[PDB]
Design a protein around this ligand. Structure first.
Ligand SMILES: N[C@@]1(O)CC=C([N+](=O)[O-])C=C1C(=O)O
Ligand SMILES: N[C@@]1(O)CC=C([N+](=O)[O-])C=C1C(=O)O
Ligand SMILES: [Zn+2]
Ligand SMILES: [Zn+2]
Lengths: 425, 422
């Protein structure tokens, strides 16, 4: 495996699909699809799949935020392979609170130039998606012989947004309604390749995460004309002032956390990092009396073998060490996984890659193995899964794909399927 | 120590609140899909008793309720978990001969007993640990670790499929797993359900299959071809009738073949055809070219859903029928790992309160869906334990005496386990 030169026919068929590949990627990439509003992108993919005869279904918690699942049905007796990429993209209509430059052309558009396709939404993640969409089209139209099904899974809400506090429900949900939902409601297979920009480097371990809301307490609040001064920062009745000290302690803890929990796996080396993604205390429209509490929100990545409570307790000890009183409240926990029994997919992939790209695969860097990918939900559910695709990673952060690379990735995908899907499950 | 004795007879002094909480909770209409009001009651109950509840939910009218009894520090934390939804809706006339019988929809205190399917499943076991927590708090029990109080929506096996999508039809995806994934974590979790004081720490997974038989061509009744052998009938309903018989045979043997013994219980994974539809009753002058059944196939923890799908496809091809066999639900079952500390804390409290070692649970009770699966899936070793016979069995009432024992077992388990070191 794979096949004979059933492969040759499919490779040429893909050669002839270069314009479709670019067109699909630009059209998809041009659709505004920040997490929370992936619907329009979903609709595009549904119709694309319908046109091409993959019998898509919308599989979603919400009628405007859904996954799209289609299939290329095999003849029987082979392993099934899922291809998966996500529908949502990074920058909403205006993320001025995160980024200082929340509106550049590259951040909200996509176009074909030279032999490149530009746009963050192409890098992450409409480009890799176009690649396996085309791969499947070629397989279908070439009449490739496949015993197993190919499952086509475009998912919403991959990006790490989460409800918390007063931000609840439809507008703020993500991973809970995405890949895991799609799989749990029918999109199952023997194996799954998650297409993301990895520069043709396969990973099959990823991090989990625990998000902590840390609320430091102080008080009592006083009207500004009555505030006691001077007072040592850690004793300040202003929770914001205490939080400032806590923040630098947590930064120290974080510097060492990633070192202490670094851990090497067959699938990659996890370097689990920590960042303080938000802070808020008091409200901007009533500032005449300082707040008795102040909260930060921490993103703490987990290697697959770390219980979230171990991390919560470590943060609680940083707080205690400072003599502060705080609530350390988790509001998100997802496990990361190393794929188990990945070998058949890893092998079929390695063989396809060598043929198409012409060299052995390189091992990915740590960040690419220490993040969230939808390989976690697949592996969680017993579907061995790895991530692989063309392009320098979005978090790199790349701003374009080479059309040559995309075409290579499409071929790798088609070859992988023609091999793996003809193995007996 | 000697808090135990104090708590024990804080609890016997609470028989009134236990009964009232169970009857009031059980009296709230809360079929899966409409569990909101039950959630509100639980939230308000938690708030009055100082457990600082939070609504944790995908929808503002279908949510989990998570509360907490905070420990002094340095101990293991324990979740108590029960679900807010109940089995019967007043409209389930499609399922039950008399879907409006009082036992399905009401709860009441009579003599020694509390009647109501909604108390058996699951307001009764919920009241048990609600009261246990209240007793632990008020008696000022010393606890190093937290007790996490987790009332979840959407535990019951309802699922979207076909045109039935979204809010009204979701369940487990927005229930316990959602609650845990969004903060309700602990070192251990006790899922309070009716188990007749027998602990289970293995449960089944499941794959739901939509099986659609194709036939045709459809004809206006005055043109229908007869006689035609069943398997050749242009009427998909007629073909499906023969397939149903074959799948019943497969199901008979399936549970034998995949029966499997675990430390946490013996799993006997069963199969049932839960629904059928072909054609529509308001247009019956031309028979349908397709007909669908919907299969509930339980999985032991070590069975891949695709193996099962293939087996069903094999039954179809042996009859020589054309059909789509389509999975529309798959969830894994788990045997807990590292359950020993909870198992032990439970066993000690149980022997003391109930006065005899625990027995292994009956196979159905560890061959079903329970929210131990999400906890174990997420690395929180979890077992299920509580008073009374299983609703699915199904039992109709709880003895208030049993409810009290359960509450005491819960309280004692916490005082032990939450004072061990994490
Ligand atoms: N009498 C009817 O109009 C009613 C129903 C059908 N039909 O089953 O398509 C045909 C008729 C016909 O012969 O015209
Ligand atoms: N897991 C359930 O809650 C859901 C469904 C039923 N039931 O269909 O009777 C019973 C259960 C039980 O009593 O454990
Ligand atoms: Zn991505
Ligand atoms: Zn139940």
């Amino acid at each position: 495996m794979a096949g004979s030169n059933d492969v040759a026919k499919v490779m040429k068929t893909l050669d002839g699909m270069r314009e479709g590949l670019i067109q699909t990627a630009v059209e998809l990439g041009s659709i505004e699809a920040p997490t929370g509003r992936e619907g329009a992108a979903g609709d595009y993919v549904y119709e694309w799949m319908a046109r091409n005869g993959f019998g898509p279904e919308r599989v979603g918690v919400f009628d405007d935020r859904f996954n799209v699942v289609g299939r290329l049905r095999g003849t029987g007796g082979g392993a099934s392979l899922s291809f998966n990429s996500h529908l949502d993209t990074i920058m909403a209509r205006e993320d001025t609170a995160r980024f200082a430059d929340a509106n550049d052309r590259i951040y909200h558009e996509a176009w074909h130039e030279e032999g490149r396709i530009y746009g963050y939404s192409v890098v992450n993640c409409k480009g890799p998606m176009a690649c396996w969409l085309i791969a499947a089209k070629a397989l279908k139209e070439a009449g490739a012989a496949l015993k197993g099904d190919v499952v086509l899974t475009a998912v919403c809400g991959e990006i790490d947004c989460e409800p918390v506090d007063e931000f609840q429900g439809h507008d703020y949900l993500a991973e809970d309604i995405g890949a895991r939902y799609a799989i749990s409601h029918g999109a199952i297979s023997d194996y799954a390749l998650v297409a993301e920009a990895t520069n043709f480097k396969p990973a099959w371990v990823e991090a989990g995460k625990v998000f902590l809301k840390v609320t430091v307490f102080a008080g009592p609040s006083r009207y500004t004309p009555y505030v006691p001064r001077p007072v040592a920062a850690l004793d300040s009745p202003n929770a914001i002032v205490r939080m400032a000290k806590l923040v630098e302690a947590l930064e120290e803890w974080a510097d060492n956390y990633e070192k202490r929990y670094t851990r090497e796996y067959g699938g990659g080396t996890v370097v689990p990092k920590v960042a303080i993604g938000a802070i808020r205390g008091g409200v901007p429209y009533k500032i005449y009396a300082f707040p008795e509490l102040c909260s930060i929100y921490m993103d703490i990545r987990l290697n697959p073998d770390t219980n979230p409570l171990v991390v919560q307790r470590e943060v609680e000890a940083v707080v205690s060490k400072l003599g502060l009183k705080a609530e350390v409240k988790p509001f998100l926990f997802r496990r990361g996984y190393e794929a188990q029994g990945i070998e058949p997919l890893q092998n079929a992939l390695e063989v396809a890659h060598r043929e198409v790209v012409g060299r052995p695969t390189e091992r990915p860097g740590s960040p690419e193995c220490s993040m969230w990918r939808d390989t976690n939900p697949y592996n969680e559910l017993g579907i061995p899964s790895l991530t692989y695709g063309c392009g320098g990673g979005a978090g790199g952060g790349n701003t374009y794909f080479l059309v040559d690379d995309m075409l290579k990735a499409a071929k790798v995908y088609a070859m992988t399927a023609m091999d793996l899907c003809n193995r007996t499950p």
